[PDB]
Short mmCIF file of C-alpha atoms in Angstrom, two decimals:
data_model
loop_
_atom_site.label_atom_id
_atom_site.label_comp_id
_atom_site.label_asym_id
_atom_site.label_seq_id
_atom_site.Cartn_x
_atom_site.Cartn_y
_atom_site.Cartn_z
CA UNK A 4 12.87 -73.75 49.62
CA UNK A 5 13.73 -71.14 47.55
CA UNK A 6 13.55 -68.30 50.42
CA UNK A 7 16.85 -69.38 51.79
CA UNK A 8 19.12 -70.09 48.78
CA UNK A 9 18.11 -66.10 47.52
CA UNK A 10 18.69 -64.80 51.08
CA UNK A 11 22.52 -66.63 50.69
CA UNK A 12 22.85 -65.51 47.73
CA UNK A 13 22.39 -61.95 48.34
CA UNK A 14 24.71 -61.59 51.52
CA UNK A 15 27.62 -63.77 49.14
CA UNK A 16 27.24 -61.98 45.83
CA UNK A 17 27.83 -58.72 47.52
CA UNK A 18 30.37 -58.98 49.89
CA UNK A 19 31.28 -55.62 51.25
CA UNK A 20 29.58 -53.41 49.79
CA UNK A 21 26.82 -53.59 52.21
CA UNK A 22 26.14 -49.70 52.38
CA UNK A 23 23.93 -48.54 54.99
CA UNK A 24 20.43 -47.02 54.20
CA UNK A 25 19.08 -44.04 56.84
CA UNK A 26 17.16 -44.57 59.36
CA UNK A 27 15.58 -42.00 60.73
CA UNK A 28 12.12 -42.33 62.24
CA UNK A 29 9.55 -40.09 60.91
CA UNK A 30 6.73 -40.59 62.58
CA UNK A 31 6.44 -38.30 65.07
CA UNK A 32 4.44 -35.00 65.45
CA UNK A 33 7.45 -32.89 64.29
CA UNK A 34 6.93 -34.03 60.43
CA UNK A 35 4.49 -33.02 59.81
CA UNK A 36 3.19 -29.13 59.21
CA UNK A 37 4.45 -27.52 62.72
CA UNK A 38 2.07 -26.59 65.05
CA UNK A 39 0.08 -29.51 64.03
CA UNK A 40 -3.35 -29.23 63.32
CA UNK A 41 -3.83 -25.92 64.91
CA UNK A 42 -1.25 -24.27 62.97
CA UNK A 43 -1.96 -20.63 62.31
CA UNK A 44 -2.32 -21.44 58.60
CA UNK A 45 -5.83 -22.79 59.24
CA UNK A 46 -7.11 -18.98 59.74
CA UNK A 47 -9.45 -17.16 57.70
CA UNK A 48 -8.06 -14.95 55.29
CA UNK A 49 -10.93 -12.05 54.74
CA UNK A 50 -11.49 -9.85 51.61
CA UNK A 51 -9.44 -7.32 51.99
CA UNK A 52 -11.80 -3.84 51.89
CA UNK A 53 -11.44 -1.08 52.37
CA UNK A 54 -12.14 -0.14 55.99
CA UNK A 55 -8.93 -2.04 56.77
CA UNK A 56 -6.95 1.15 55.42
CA UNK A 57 -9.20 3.91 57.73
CA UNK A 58 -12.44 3.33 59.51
CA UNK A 59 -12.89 6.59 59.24
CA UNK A 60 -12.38 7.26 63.15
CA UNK A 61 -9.81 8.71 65.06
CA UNK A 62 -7.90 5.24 66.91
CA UNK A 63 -9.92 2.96 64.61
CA UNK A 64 -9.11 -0.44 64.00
CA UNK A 65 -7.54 -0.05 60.21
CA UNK A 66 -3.64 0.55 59.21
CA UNK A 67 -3.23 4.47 58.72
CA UNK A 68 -5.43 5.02 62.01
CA UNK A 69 -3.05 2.72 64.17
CA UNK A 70 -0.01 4.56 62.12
CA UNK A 71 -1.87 7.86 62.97
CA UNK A 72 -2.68 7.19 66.85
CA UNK A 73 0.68 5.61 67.01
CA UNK A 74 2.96 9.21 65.86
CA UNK A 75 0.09 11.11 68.19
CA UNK A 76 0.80 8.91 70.97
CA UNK A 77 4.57 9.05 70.33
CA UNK A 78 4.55 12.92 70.34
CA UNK A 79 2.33 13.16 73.03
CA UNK A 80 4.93 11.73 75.55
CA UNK A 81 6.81 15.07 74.63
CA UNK A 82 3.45 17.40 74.83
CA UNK A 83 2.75 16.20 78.41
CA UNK A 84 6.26 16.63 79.44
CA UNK A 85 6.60 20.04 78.59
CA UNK A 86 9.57 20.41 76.02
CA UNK A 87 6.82 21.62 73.40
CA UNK A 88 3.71 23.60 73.89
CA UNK A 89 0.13 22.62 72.39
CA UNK A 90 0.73 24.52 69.14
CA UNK A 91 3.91 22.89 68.05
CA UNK A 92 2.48 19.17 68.62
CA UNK A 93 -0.48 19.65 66.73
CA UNK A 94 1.72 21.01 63.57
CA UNK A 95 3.79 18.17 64.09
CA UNK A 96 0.75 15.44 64.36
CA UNK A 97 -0.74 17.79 61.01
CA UNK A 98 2.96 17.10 58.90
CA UNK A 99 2.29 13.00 59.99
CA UNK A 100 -0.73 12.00 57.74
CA UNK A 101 0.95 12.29 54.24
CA UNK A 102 3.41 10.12 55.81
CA UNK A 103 1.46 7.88 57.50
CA UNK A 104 -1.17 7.75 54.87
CA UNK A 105 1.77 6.72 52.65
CA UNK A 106 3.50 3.97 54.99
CA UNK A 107 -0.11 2.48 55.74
CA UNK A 108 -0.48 1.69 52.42
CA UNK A 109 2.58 0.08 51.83
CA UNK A 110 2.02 -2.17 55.12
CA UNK A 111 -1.70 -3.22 53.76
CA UNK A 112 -0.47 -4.38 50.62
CA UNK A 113 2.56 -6.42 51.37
CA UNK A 114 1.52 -7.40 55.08
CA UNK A 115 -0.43 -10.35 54.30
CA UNK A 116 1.81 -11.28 51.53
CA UNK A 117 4.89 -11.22 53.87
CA UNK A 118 3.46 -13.71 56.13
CA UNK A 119 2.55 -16.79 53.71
CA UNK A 120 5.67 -16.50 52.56
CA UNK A 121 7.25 -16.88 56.15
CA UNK A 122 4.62 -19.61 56.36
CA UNK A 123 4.93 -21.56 52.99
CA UNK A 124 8.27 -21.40 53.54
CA UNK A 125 8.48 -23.17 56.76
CA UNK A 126 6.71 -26.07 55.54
CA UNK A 127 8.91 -26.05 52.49
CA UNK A 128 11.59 -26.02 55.36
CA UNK A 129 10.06 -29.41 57.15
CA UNK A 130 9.65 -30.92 53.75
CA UNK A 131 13.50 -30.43 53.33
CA UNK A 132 14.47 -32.27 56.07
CA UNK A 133 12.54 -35.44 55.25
CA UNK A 134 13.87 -34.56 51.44
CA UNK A 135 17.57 -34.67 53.21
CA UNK A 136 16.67 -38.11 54.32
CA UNK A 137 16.20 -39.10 50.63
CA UNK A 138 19.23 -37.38 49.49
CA UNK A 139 20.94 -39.78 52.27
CA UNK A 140 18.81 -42.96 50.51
CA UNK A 141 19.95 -42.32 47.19
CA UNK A 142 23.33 -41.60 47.60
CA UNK A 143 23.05 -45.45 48.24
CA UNK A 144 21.53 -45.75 45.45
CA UNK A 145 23.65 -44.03 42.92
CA UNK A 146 26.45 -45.72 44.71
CA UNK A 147 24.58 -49.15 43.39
CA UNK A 148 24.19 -47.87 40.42
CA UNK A 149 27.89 -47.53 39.87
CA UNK A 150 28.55 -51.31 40.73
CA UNK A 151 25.40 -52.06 38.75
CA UNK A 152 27.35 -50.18 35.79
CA UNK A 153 30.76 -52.66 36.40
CA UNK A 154 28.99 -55.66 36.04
CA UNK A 155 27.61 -54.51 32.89
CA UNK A 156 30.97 -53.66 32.08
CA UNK A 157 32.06 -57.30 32.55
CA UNK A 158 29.02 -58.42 31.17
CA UNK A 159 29.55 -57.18 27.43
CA UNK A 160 33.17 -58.05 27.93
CA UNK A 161 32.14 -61.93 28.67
CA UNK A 162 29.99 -61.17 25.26
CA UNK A 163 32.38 -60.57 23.33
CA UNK A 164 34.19 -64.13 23.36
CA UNK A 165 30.47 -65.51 22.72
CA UNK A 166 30.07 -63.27 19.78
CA UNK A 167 33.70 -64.37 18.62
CA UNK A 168 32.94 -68.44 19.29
CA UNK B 113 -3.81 -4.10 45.27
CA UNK B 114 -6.76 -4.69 47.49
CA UNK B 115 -7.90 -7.44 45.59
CA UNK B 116 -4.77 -9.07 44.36
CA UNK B 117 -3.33 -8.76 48.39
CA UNK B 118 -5.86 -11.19 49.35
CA UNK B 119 -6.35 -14.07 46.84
CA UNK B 120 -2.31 -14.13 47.59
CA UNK B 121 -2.90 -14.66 51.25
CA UNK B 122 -5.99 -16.98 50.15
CA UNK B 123 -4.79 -19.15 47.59
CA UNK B 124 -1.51 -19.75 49.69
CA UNK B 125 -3.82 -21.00 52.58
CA UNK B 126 -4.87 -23.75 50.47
CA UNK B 127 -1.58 -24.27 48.94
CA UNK B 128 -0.46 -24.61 52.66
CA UNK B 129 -3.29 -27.17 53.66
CA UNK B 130 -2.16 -29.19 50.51
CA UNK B 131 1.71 -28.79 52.10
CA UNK B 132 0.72 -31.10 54.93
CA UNK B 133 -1.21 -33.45 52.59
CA UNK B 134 2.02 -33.38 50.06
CA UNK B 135 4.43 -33.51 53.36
CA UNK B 136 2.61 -37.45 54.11
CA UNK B 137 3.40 -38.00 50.91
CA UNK B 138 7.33 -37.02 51.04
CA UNK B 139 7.06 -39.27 54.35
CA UNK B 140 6.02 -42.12 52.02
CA UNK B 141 8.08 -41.60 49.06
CA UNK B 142 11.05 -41.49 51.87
CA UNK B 143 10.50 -45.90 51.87
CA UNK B 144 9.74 -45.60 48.48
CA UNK B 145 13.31 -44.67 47.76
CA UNK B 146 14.47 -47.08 51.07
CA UNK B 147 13.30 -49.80 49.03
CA UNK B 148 14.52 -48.66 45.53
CA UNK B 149 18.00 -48.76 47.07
CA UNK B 150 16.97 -52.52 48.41
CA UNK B 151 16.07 -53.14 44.57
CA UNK B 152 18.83 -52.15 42.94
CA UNK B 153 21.16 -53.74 45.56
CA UNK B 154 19.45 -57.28 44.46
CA UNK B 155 19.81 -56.25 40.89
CA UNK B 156 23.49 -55.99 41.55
CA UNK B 157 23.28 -59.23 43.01
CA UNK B 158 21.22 -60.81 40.07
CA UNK B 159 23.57 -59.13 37.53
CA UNK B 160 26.62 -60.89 38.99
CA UNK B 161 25.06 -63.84 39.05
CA UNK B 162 24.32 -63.79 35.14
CA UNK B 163 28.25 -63.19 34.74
CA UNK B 164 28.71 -66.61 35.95
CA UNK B 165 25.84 -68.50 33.61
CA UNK B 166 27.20 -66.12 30.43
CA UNK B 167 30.77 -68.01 31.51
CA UNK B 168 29.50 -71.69 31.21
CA UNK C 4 27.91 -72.72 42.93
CA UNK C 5 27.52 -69.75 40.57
CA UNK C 6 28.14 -67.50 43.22
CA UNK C 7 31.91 -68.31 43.03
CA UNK C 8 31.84 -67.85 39.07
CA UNK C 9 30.13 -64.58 39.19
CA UNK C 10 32.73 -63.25 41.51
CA UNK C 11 36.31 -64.64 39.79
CA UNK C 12 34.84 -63.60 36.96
CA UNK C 13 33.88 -59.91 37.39
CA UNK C 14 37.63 -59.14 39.35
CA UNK C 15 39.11 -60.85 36.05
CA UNK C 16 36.81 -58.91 33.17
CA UNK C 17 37.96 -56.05 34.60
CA UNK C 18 41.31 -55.81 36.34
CA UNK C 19 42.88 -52.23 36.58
CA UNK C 20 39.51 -50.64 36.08
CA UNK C 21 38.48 -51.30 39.85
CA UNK C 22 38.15 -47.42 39.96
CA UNK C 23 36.64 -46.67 43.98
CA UNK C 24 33.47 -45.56 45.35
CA UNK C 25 32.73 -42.58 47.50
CA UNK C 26 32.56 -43.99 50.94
CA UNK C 27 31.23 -40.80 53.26
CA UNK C 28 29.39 -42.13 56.28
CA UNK C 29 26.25 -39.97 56.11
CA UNK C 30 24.72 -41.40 59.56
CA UNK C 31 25.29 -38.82 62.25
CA UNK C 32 23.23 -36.06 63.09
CA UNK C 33 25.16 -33.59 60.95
CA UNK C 34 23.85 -34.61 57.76
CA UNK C 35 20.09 -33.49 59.10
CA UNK C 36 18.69 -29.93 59.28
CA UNK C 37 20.86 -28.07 61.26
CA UNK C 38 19.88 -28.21 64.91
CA UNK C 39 18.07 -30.95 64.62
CA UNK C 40 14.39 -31.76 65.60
CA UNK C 41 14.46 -28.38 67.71
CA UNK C 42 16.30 -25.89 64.85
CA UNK C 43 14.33 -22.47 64.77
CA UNK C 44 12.68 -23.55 61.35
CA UNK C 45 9.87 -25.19 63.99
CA UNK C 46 8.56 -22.12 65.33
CA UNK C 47 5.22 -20.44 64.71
CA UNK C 48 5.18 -18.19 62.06
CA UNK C 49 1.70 -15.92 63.48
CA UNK C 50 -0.16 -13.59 60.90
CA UNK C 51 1.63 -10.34 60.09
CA UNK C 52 -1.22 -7.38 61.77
CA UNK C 53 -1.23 -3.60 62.16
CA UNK C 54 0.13 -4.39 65.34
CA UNK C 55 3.31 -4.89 64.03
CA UNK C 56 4.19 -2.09 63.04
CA UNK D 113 10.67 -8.20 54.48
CA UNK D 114 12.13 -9.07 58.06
CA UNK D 115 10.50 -12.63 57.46
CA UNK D 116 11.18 -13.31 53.87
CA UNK D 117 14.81 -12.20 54.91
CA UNK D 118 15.07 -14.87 57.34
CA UNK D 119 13.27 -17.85 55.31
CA UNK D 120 16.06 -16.93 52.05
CA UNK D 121 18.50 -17.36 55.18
CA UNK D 122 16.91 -20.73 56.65
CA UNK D 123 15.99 -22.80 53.78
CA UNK D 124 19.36 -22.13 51.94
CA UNK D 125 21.50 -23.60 55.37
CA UNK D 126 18.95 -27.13 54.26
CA UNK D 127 19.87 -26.12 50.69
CA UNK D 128 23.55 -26.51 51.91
CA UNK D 129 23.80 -29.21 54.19
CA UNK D 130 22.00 -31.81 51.46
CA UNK D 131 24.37 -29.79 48.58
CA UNK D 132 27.02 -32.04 50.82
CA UNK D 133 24.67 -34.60 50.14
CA UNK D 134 24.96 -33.56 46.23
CA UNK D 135 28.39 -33.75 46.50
CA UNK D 136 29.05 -37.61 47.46
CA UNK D 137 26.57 -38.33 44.89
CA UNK D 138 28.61 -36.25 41.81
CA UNK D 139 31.59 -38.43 43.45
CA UNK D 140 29.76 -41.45 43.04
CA UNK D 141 28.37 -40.50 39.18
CA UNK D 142 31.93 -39.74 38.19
CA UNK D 143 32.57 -43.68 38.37
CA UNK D 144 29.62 -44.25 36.61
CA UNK D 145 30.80 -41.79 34.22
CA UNK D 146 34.19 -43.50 33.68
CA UNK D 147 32.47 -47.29 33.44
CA UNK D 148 29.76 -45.48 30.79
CA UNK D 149 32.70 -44.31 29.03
CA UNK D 150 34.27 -48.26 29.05
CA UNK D 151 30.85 -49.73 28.54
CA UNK D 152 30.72 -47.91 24.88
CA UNK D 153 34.50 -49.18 24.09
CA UNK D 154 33.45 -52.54 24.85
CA UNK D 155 30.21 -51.75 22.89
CA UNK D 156 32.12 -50.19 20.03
CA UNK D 157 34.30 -53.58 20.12
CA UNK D 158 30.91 -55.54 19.71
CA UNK D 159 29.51 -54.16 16.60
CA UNK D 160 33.11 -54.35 14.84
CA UNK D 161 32.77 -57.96 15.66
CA UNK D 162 29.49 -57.93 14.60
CA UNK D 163 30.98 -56.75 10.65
CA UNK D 164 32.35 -60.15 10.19
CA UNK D 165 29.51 -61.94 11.24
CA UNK D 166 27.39 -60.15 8.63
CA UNK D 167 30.19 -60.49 6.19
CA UNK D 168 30.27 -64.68 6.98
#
């Protein structure tokens, strides 16, 4: 029976130095990519045309129209409250679309971008966690390694009386 | 930009499908090095039990 | 019994030398991602629209 | 850039609690640095033994 005399062995050999591995438990539904299978990283990224800048219509469905009806519909609230007759909001609304036009672009290219990288990031923030719980499994191991480097030590010092018999 | 803008947000979708493939993979690695502590535990073991045969 | 050998003679090959190990307990729930299993990393990072801004 | 601020801000605190990680381990190398530095005296011992052997 040679299972038992390497079992005894073990637990008498190294005596003490019986450093505790982790233990977490992952194997729930938090590991893995959150959200789980219906993460919104399974979407479907579409070509990016151009009728996602204007559809050329006033309150479209692009970038510089929702910029657009967005500064008409903020200076509107004034309009309808007095504080500015018809002639003053229009200029106003007129002076918007170089800026608008300008601050559209910058959203469309950049605003898919921005979001990948709040998502690839997040899984590259999961993955850390169970890459923690190898940085706690071999700090064990480098510890080992240190004893593993004493008895080595030892070793070529017991070699050196064989070398001088 | 048009272009560029989406291959970025397409070629990170699949590099974020592959995540949850590669994050099974850091949850079987994690044993991986569980054992490889185990194994170089016994190999402390084995080494000082050659100290004592190198002695007789 | 070469498990006695082994032992008298590593603590006698190198006396002095026994230079110490590190002995941090890294088992409690500090040595984790901050917050634990509910820390904000686990939210739901949804698509950045033109409703945004 | 509200995002990517936030990410740089949450995967550097994981980037800092396993750096404590780091730092047991770089106390637990240093040993193994000090026996690797007796382990090539011992060495260095063994080949000048090993002139007279070759000389015999």
């Amino acid at each position: 029976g040679a299972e038992v005399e390497a079992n005894r062995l073990l637990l008498a050999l190294t005596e003490g130095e019986d450093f505790a591995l982790p233990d977490i438990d992952m194997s729930g539904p938090e590991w893995d990519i959150p959200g789980g299978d219906g993460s919104p990283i399974f979407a479907e990224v579409t070509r990016l045309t151009n009728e996602d800048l204007t559809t050329r219509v006033v309150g479209g469905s692009g970038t510089f129209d929702a910029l657009m009806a967005s500064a008409a519909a903020h200076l509107k609230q004034e309009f309808k409250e007095g504080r500015i007759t018809g002639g003053e909001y229009t200029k106003a609304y007129i002076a918007i679309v170089e800026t608008c036009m300008g601050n559209a672009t910058q959203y469309l290219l950049g605003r898919d971008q921005a979001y990948w990288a709040a998502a690839m990031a997040q899984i590259q923030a999961v993955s850390a966690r169970v890459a923690l719980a190898t940085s706690k499994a071999q700090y064990v191991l480098a510890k080992f390694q240190a004893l593993n480097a004493k008895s080595e030590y030892a070793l070529t010092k017991l070699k050196l009386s064989t070398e001088s018999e």
